[PDB]
Amino acid sequence: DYAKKRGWVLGPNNYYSFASQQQKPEDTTIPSTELAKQVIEYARQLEMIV
Amino acid sequence: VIDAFRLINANHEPRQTTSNLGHLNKPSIQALIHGLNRHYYSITINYRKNELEQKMLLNLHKKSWMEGLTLQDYSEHCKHNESVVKEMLELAKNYNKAVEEEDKMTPEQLAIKNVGKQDPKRHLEEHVDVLMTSNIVQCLAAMLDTVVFK
């Protein structure tokens, strides 16, 4: 019953997977918009009159 | 350097005045020496331009559009960066060796401390501006391309 309550696959007898992989995040997409804004802000602060 | 002239006759004042438009130029010593306002007098020069002249004079210095989105040979980028930083190393050493002074130096003596001798501060300012501009521009181009073309 307790195994049922939790998210356990309930494999072979006394054999349940916990999915410790955590999906193993490997995908990467090069977030650019943020990087472009960051760089333009460097340039802004660099050239404004302070 | 340019000017427009005309001849004063042997007669008085050569011309009549109804504005300040004549007297705004302060004629040069050489022109006076050689005869200005005695045998000849100057005239104001106007460079008035129409619309199409204005539009092409602004369009000379404009590069193609591709040049705007071209990166640099990245290897040359890195070589340039490492060269400038290897220069900043020695400039920082000299900056240290120079800030220690400016206390043991007469208020007048400082004005001559920098004649024939490198100054670390100004060179550091120049190099920092160069490095930071170049790297910012390359980064932005790389990201902008990374998005635009697929």
B99: tokens are 């800030």
d(CA B150, CA B148): 6
Query: What is the rounded (10 degree) CA torsion for A36, A37, A40, A44?
Result: -170
Interface membership of B142 toward A (CB under 8 Å): no
Burial of B143 (0-12, 13-18, 19+ CB in 10 A): buried
Interface membership of A16 toward B (CB under 8 Å): no
Resolution, expressed in angstroms to one decimal: 2.9
The experimental method behind these coordinates is: cryo-EM
A9: tokens are 């696959």
Helix intervals (H) in chain B: 29-33, 51-59, 74-99, 109-113, 120-148
Interface membership of B139 toward A (CB under 8 Å): yes
d(CA B29, CA B134): 47
B98: tokens are 């120079």
User: Between chains, do A42 and B144 touch, taking CB under 8 Å as contact?
Assistant: no
d(CA B150, CA B146): 8
B143 contacts in chain A (CB < 8 Å): 32, 35-36, 39
User: Between chains, do B139 and A35 touch, taking CB under 8 Å as contact?
Assistant: yes
User: Between chains, do A46 and B132 touch, taking CB under 8 Å as contact?
Assistant: yes
HEC profile of chain A: CHHHHCCCCCCCCCCCCCCCCCCCCCCCCCCCHHHHHHHHHHHHHHHCCC
